């Protein structure tokens, strides 16, 4: 696969789609430094446009923790009925 | 965030 290939599933949670790129991009062969732009690119633009659009409203300087935070429960959220 | 943020949160 490709990091390029990753992108978030229209109801799939936030912190599912983190954990698919993270595995992805450690497999990807790129240089760190390359790794990096990849994580603070990427990341936010192939989310979903739910989270996409709380993840630029808390600004580059937030932490994953925080982004996990702010997008708990958009698409969801996923009790069973 | 950097990709050493994913490898610190999931390491």
Same mark, same amino acid.
């Given at each position: 696969?490709?990091? +390029? !290939?990753?992108?978030? %599933?229209?109801? &799939?949670?936030?912190? !599912?789609? $983190?954990?698919?790129?993270?595995?992805? +991009?450690? /497999?990807?062969?790129?240089?760190?430094? $390359?790794?990096?732009?990849?994580? /603070?690119? +990427?990341? $936010?633009?192939?989310?979903?446009?739910?989270?996409?659009?709380?993840?630029?409203?808390?600004?580059? %300087?937030?932490?994953?923790? &925080?982004?996990?935070? /702010?997008?708990?429960?958009?698409? %969801?959220? %996923?009790?069973?009925? | 965030?950097?990709?050493?943020?994913?490898?610190? #949160? #999931?390491?």
């Amino acid at each position: 696969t490709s990091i +390029l !290939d990753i992108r978030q %599933g229209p109801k &799939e949670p936030f912190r !599912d789609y $983190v954990d698919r790129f993270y595995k992805t +991009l450690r /497999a990807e062969q790129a240089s760190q430094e $390359v790794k990096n732009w990849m994580t /603070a690119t +990427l990341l $936010v633009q192939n989310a979903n446009p739910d989270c996409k659009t709380i993840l630029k409203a808390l600004g580059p %300087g937030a932490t994953l923790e &925080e982004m996990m935070t /702010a997008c708990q429960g958009v698409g %969801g959220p %996923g009790h069973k009925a | 965030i950097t990709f050493e943020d994913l490898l610190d #949160y #999931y390491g």
